[PDB]
Amino acid sequence: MESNNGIILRVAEANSTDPGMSRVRLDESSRRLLDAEIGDVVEIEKVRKTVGRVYRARPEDENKGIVRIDSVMRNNCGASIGDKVKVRKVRTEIAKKVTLAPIIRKDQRLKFGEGIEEYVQRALIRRPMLEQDNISVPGLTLAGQTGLLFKVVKTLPSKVPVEIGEETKIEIREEPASEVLEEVSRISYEDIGGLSEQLGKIREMIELPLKHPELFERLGITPPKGVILYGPPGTGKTLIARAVANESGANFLSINGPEIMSKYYGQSEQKLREIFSKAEETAPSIIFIDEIDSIAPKREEVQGEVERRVVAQLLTLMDGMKERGHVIVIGATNRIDAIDPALRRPGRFDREIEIGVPDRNGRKEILMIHTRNMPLGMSEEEKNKFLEEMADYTYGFVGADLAALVRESAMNALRRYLPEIDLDKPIPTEILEKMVVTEDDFKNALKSIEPSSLREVMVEVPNVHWDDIGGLEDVKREIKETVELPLLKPDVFKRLGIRPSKGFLLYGPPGVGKTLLAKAVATESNANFISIKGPEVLSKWVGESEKAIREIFKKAKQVAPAIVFLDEIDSIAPRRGTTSDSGVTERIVNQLLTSLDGIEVMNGVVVIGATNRPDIMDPALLRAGRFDKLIYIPPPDKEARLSILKVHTKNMPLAPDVDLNDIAQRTEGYVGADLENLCREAGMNAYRENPDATSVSQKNFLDALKTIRPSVDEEVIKFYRTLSET
């Protein structure tokens, strides 16, 4: 990694795709170590003396220590993670003409198209080029068209590494050419969109079984056997295992279930045994069984004992290896519930990896992986497409869905462009210029979408703060003491001999904006936001997943610290019946008690219940340890309402035409959720299509005032006041 840089620099993976390639991100403080100015061309040289020369370029968030590098340069130079390099300031000259040839292995005799306008011109923008070095220019969504690998057979400035500005003619030969360098179809970690933390968390964790073979194979420590993967597919499960294989240098051997179901009675097992034994003798290699869940579900529900021994044998084949051949059996599955206890015991698989559906941050990264093969990407075209925009329309979808989604974006572009022009056997050059991906390609691609999976609550943080919602400072001032302090002050409550409580219960009028109260304490904690809505219980009540509902806490336990917020969950108790068809409880209700009582009072997880109809609960949540603290949400008052109105209403334009005091007298009946609606509705009455300098007017508030009904009654406020007594 780092020698105290300026010569040996730590290599990282580009968080962007970068313009072209040779553009390489460095830090101002790091740029002084090699002593040059941005825009300069520097050459990085390392083991094998395989080289490329790149640009000194901007940082973004970069720590002083890293260098964001594209895997293309790494693949050409074969750079592993955190390698050591020799960099120096080099004088780069002007090219005259460079003779290139496509890779026949990857092409298979397809593209004769003339790329002087497209590939070449793109290559004419400030790209250093090396003779006898294979380099690629991305872009061009698939017609059969990618950034195509071009090895330099000759450069007119013979045996001189040179840079191509915009004058020179790059030479497209199309002549067959063969090299040793690997087909880049074998991927890199960067090719996996995933997430940062997730991919990283999995990266260094999947890094340890190998670590790296080069300087350290095994001296201290030791391998912890195999690995397991969970969850539905991301960009892919086979891709994650394969990306680890390619960069690591170990051979990649795919073992799947259907191959075992193909042949029986020693035909598959001997074939599987041979491939297993062949993997070690051919090591380094990666042994990966995806469908093991299908072959080894065993609760003894399946049949064909001869089939059970086969996988129970593959388990015995693993420990037959000393871990001296440097190969790992990597498992994968959709669910951990399917495992046989044999897979569970250490010595076979002791490692656990959860593949979750990447958040918008991940889908934002997946947009880049696709825009690497196609135009129209953020900063790729000078017109900027902000990645959060496209992510706004992707909900819980994965890479395979985004790919299929982008595949349709291009397919539509194809469906429009090509058929109207049709085409012939030769691929014209013109079609590549006319080809333009449009923001509509996403629109028409979004027209076909669907979730394939069952919902399981996920982490997030809002922007809410105490000021973002007004009123009720008394309960608010208490929430600080309840949640934040046990996290920041675990050692205090020991000296006090006072044992805190796990969680509390918010109860008050229906729909006070109770969700906002959770979001407020959520952002404050700077932790993850987990809210269990009724509909989620409904959805999980249909699939008899009430089991899964307990993993929501388990998930909260592993991702801790987090705040698990239970909304309306109380309804489950009376749902079938309170005492009617069930006495105090269901099998679902006890699950909350199991996880809540089992976990310690002070942990990274914070439990918050919310019920605005608190009596229909069965007593379980009321008893000690079961949500002890009873927190009542009283309705806002004339000052809070005035204070809640002023906060939510000033997020848009405002004018003296409507004032806080006069409207406050008009609302005695509305909670945080209702008040914010009045502000929007009043603005929906006026319009800025016809001239308006403000989004609100007193006449408009009076219109919304008529629409909304002061549903509050001192009667409905009495049940809570009387109920807290009973």
Next chain:
Amino acid sequence: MESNNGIILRVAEANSTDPGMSRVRLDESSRRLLDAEIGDVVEIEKVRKTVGRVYRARPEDENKGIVRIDSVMRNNCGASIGDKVKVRKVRTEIAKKVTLAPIIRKDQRLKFGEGIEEYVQRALIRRPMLEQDNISVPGLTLAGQTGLLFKVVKTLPSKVPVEIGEETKIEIREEPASEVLEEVSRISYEDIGGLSEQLGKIREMIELPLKHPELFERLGITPPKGVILYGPPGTGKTLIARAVANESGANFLSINGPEIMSKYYGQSEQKLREIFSKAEETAPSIIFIDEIDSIAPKREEVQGEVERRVVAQLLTLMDGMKERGHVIVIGATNRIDAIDPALRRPGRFDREIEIGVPDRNGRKEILMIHTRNMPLGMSEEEKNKFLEEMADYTYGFVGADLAALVRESAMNALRRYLPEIDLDKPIPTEILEKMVVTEDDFKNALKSIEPSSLREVMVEVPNVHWDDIGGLEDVKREIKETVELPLLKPDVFKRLGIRPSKGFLLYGPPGVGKTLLAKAVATESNANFISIKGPEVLSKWVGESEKAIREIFKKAKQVAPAIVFLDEIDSIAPRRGTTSDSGVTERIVNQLLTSLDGIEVMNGVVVIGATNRPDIMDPALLRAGRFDKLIYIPPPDKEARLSILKVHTKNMPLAPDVDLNDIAQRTEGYVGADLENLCREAGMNAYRENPDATSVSQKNFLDALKTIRPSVDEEVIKFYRTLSET
């Protein structure tokens, strides 16, 4: 003990690993009978006329006739536990130069002698050594490498024992040490701290077949043929057996069934015959079948000719015993009902053993086995390496989880250490010196885990006494005569005509601390505790474990004297529709009724029911002969409530200005739960919620009065009484 507490003694194992491997824990009289006192280095000579020196040490629980000593010195000399030893105090000698060599197997040429400064130079601890001594030092990296073993090839003083002072120079010649040996890495009795009574039983069972100096003619007993193990495997389960072989010095054979079941019809049998034949030349030896579960599962479920011939071959192995050459048969399975009736009966397996799960303690003694190899001799950080603080957190898991947990703990530390430094081919000293353990990594690793516990009940005895909860001296005096006396005075009963009762049923308001009432008498009875409650019972229902309900009594029966406590048995009957799906009855009650009638009270079991509403359920549990005495728990009262509050206030700081009499008299319609929360909620007001350093105040108990509200109504409290009258 041993016949002589003087020079001649018996050798016993160190119960705590301790730094004292080179030290020896020595009783106060045993030293006096020998000679001198604490502070003297001693020379020990024993059977085989091999010697070693050590430093003595202070007793705590020791009895004169045992000197608790490490396996290192014994394994170095090669001695087992129970051998006779000649100990004396001698001169403290010193080495001018000393040699040490690593093991070949452990190395495989992986360490060239770097590390001299971090280990040995720091290893000069004034630990008495011997000529050609084999010394073990802890250290290095973890991820699961065990203690670092050295052999002394040379000590510059010619053929004399020495103790290591802190000056001397040291030689590492990169020379051989041993390519073969019985090591501490090869496991020992000490490495497992969970077995206490079980390990004891195995001794008479392994010894006599190994024989031993004490017994040959074998009065009574017999050469037991086989052994069976139970419980989740992988933690000690596989290690226990191979540990009995290493310490017994017998010849060990590990058997893997699926690799035997690999071959069919005559290829497998000869392999089995060879494993058994192999045990004949080594007879007496150790046969261990881990896969017996998979080898003979057949209750008539799975068919085929192979499983009957392989077991029949195993059944043939039971007849092949000459009994003068007797070899041990050990096996591992997750239950007894899994194997086949032929093997269950004597003549093949006459010994069937349950291997349980560790307690917070039991897990703690598994930690020091791991901590032995962990750096940072002691922790001032948060949790001291007196390990009480680390062990108590978890609901608890087996050693494999702790191993993988601490295995990843040192890994989390490595993640912060190594990736920043990385390394080159060599591993210098400073790197090993800089890195040390940190408890936060154990917590970060605690967040990545799984609850290996599936369905089961660990038992214990509580600390609750009658002082923890006061009031109702009549019921307090009643539970004593009902619980204790059946154990203490069953004979007084028969002479005068009364017979030991069956059980009694507690009932009263919810959350009065009724869960503590049983724990209170449980401490007085000094018996084992069992809690039968809904979340646990329903957990059996989810897994259709109802048979296990009977196993709880049977398990409480083998570990008896024990106490079983049934609360929440309410929720059991109605939730299946006591009156809804049947008239009064369900299946689960039959399990309790069947098991309740099947057990008996001379087995050390105390049947205790607890019910909030003794009506809705079946009269069986209510009728006498199942639950005899009926006990109503009335609500706390001022004078008793006062004492209970005095029990709470002595756990936290206190001020004179607060008086428990007045507030207790301001409190009405409350159970013990509200108050134990009250005192806590009050203390929160004074010190932290109001951010001061100060002890509580009367306003705080008044502030809690505003927070707390009546729960139990005086009218229903009368209803419970009238309800009981009927």
